[PDB]
C-alpha cells in the first residue's frame with residue numbers, strides 16, 4: 001500500500017519530480033509508469049522470500065528499481081538509464097536494525113559519489 | 123579515488139559511523155572491511171561493462187554493497203544483513219543525467235520507506 | 245487511476261448508467277463487474293507490449309472490452325453481447341496524436357452507424 | 367452501402383476530417399484509403415459469422431478499423447497508428463440493444479480516457 | 489476495489505484498532521498485513537465460483553479471514569488465532585437478501601456467544 | 611448448553627427475526643430448524659479438535675452456519691443461501707483474546723461490506 005503514485009525526483013531533493021502512476025500489482029509487486037515525450041519513467045517494487053533450504057537461514061529480499069527509457073532519436077537508438085536497490089535480511093531480523101543499513105547506504109550514495117562511480121573509481 | 127576508508131553510517135545521517143578500511147582491490151572491484159567481536163562489516167564496489175553485441179547498446183553497471191555479518195551465537199546461527207545498489211547506463215551516456223537518477227533513488231529511500239518495504243508494502 | 249468504478253452508459257450519453265466495480269487487476273489488466281438477476285456486466289482493460297524484434301518497430305496495444313452476459317432462461321441458452329476497442333501505436337509515439345485517432349473512431353461510431361453495421365452494410 | 371467515402375475526423379468532432387475513398391469491397395468487407403504526403407489513412411469495415419458449432423449459440427462479429435501509416439523519415443523508420451472496434455452478438459439478438467452497448471463504449475472512450483490508457487492506467 | 493488498508497478492531501466496536509496494509513491482490517484475492525513486535529496480523533479475502541455442474545445450480549463463495557500469528561517465545565512455540573467467514577449463494581441471487589443473512593450471522597455472533605463457542609457449548 | 615431456540619435476525623439488528631427450534635444435538639454439534647411456506651432456515655454449530663500431531667500445536671475449530679433453503683418454484687429449482695463462521699485457536703489459548711478477534715470480524719462484516727463481497731470486490 002505505497003500509494004497510487006510514486007514520485008521520482010531527479011537530481012535528488014532538488015527538484016524535477018516525475019510522478020508515476022501505479023500500472024500493475026501482482027505477486028507482492030507494484031509497477032508505476034510515466035510516458036513522457038522523449039523518454040518514459042518506470043519504477044518497480046518487489047518483495048521476495050529466498051528459497052528455503054534444510055540447515056540454513058532463510059532470507060527475504062526487497063527491491064526498488066527506477067528506469068528511464070530514452071526513445072530512439074534519429075540515428076541514435078533507444079537506450080536506458082537505470083538504478084536500483086536491494087535489501088536482504090534473514091526472516092525475523094530486527095527491522096529497525098535492517099532499516100539502519102541501507103538508510104546508511106542512501107546516505108553514502110550522493111551526487112559526488114555517483115560521479116566517482118561512473119568514473120569507475122573504487 | 124573513492125577513498126582508503128569507507129564509512130557506513132548506520133541509521134543514516136547522524137547515525138553510528140562504522141569506518142571500514144580498503145583491504146583488497148581486484149577486477150575493477152574494491153573491498154572495505156571492519157571487523158568487530160560480534161559481527162563484521164564489509165563494503166564492496168563493483169564495475170562491469172556488459173559485452174558488445176552486434177546490434178545493441180552496450181551498458182555499464184556500477185554496484186555498491188554493504189554487508190553486516192553477524193557471527194553465530196549460541197543456538198542462533200550466523201546470518202547477514204545486506205543492502206546494495208546498482209546503477210546501469212549505456213556507455214557514452216551523460217554522467218550528470220545518470221547521477222541524477224541515482225540521487226532520485228537515494229532520496230526516495232528513507233527510513234519511513236524502508237519501514238514500509240520490510241512490511242511488504244508494494 | 246482510471247477509477248474504482250467504471251460506468252457503462254447503455255444507449256450512449258444520457259442512456260442507462262450501469263456502474264461496475266473493479267474486482268480484479270492482474271497482468272496489466274483490470275476487470276470491473278456488476279452482477280444483476282437476469283444478466284451481468286463486465287468490463288476489461290488490457291495493455292500489451294508486442295515483443296522487441298531485431299529490425300522492427302515495437303508496438304503497444306490498449307484494449308477495452310464491454311460484455312453483457314445474459315443468463316440462460318427457459319429454452320433460450322445463455323449468450324452474450326460484446327463490444328471492444330483496440331488502440332495500437334509504436335512505443336515512443338506522440339500520445340496526443342494517437343489519442344486523436346481513437347477520438348476519431350469514437351466519433352465515427354454512433355447509433356446510426358452501429359445500425360448499418362449490424363445490417364451488414366459495408 | 368456505407369457510401370463511397372468515409373471520413374475520419376482526427377481529434378474527434380473537432381475537426382481535421384480526412385475523407386477516404388472506397389478502394390475495395392469483397393466478402394462483406396469495404397476498404398477506404400487516402401494517401402497524403404507524409405502519411406496515409408486507411409479504414410476497413412468487416413462483417414463475420416463466427417464458426418457454427420453443434421450445441422452452442424452462434425455469433426456475428428462486426429469490425430471497423432482506422433489506420434494511419436507514417437512513412438519513414440530519414441533515419442526514423444516507417445510506423446503505424448491504429449484503432450479499431452469489434453462488436454459481437456448472437457445471431458438474432460435485438461439490434462437496438464446491441465447498438466446500445468458500444469454506443470456506450472464510444473461514449474466512454476474520449477480524449478481524457480485515451481490519455482489514461484496510453485499511460486497504461488487500468 | 490477494497491482499499492489500501494483494512495482495520496481489525498480487536499474486541500469489536502470501540503476495541504483496539506489494528507490497521508493492516510494491503511500487501512497483494514491477485515486471483516480475485518486480497519491480502520493485508522501488519523507485522524508487530526510480538527505478533528503479526530493478516531487478513532485475506534477470496535472469491536470463488538464453485539464447479540459448474542450439468543443439471544445443478546451454480547454457486548459463488550465469498551471468504552474473509554483474520555489471522556493473528558504469535559511468534560515463538562522461549563519454550564512457547566509459534567501459534568495462530570483465526571476467524572473467518574464464508575458466504576455462499578447461487579449466481580443471480582438477490583444481493584440484498586443474501587446480505588441480510590450475513591448480517592444476521594454477524595449480529596448473532598457477539599462476545600457472549602464467542603465465549604460459549606470457545607467453551608464448547610453446543 | 612445453547613438453548614431451545616436460536617434467532618436469526620435477517621438484515622442484522624432490528625431486522626426480521628426467525629426463531630429456529632433446536633432439532634438435535636450430538637457430536638458436540640447442534641442443529642436448529644424453522645420450516646416455512648416457501649423456504650426453511652437451519653443453523654448448525656460444530657466443535658472440532660484438529661488432528662493432534664507430534665511436534666506441533668493442537669488446534670480447535672468452532673463453526674456456526676446459517677442456511678436458508680428456498681424450495682423449488684415452478685421452473686426455478688431449489689437453492690440455498692449460506693453464511694458461516696469458523697474460529698480456530700490452539701488448546702490453552704486465552705479465550706478473551708481469541709474472542710476479541712471474532713468480535714473484530716463480526717464488527718468488520720457489515721451490510722456495506724457484504725455488498726462489496728457479493729460484488730466480487732477483492
Ligand SMILES: [Ca+2]
Pocket residue numbers: 010011012111221222225
Ligand atoms: Ca544532480
Ligand SMILES: [Ca+2]
Pocket residue numbers: 025026027269270271513514
Ligand atoms: Ca494483481
Ligand SMILES: [Ca+2]
Pocket residue numbers: 096099100103133134233
Ligand atoms: Ca534508523
Ligand SMILES: [Ca+2]
Pocket residue numbers: 255256355462465466469
Ligand atoms: Ca440507442
Ligand SMILES: [Ca+2]
Pocket residue numbers: 343344347376377378477
Ligand atoms: Ca484530441
Ligand SMILES: [Ca+2]
Pocket residue numbers: 391392393
Ligand atoms: Ca468485390
Ligand SMILES: [Ca+2]
Pocket residue numbers: 498499500599706709710713
Ligand atoms: Ca472482547
Ligand SMILES: [Ca+2]
Pocket residue numbers: 584587588591620621622721
Ligand atoms: Ca440488509
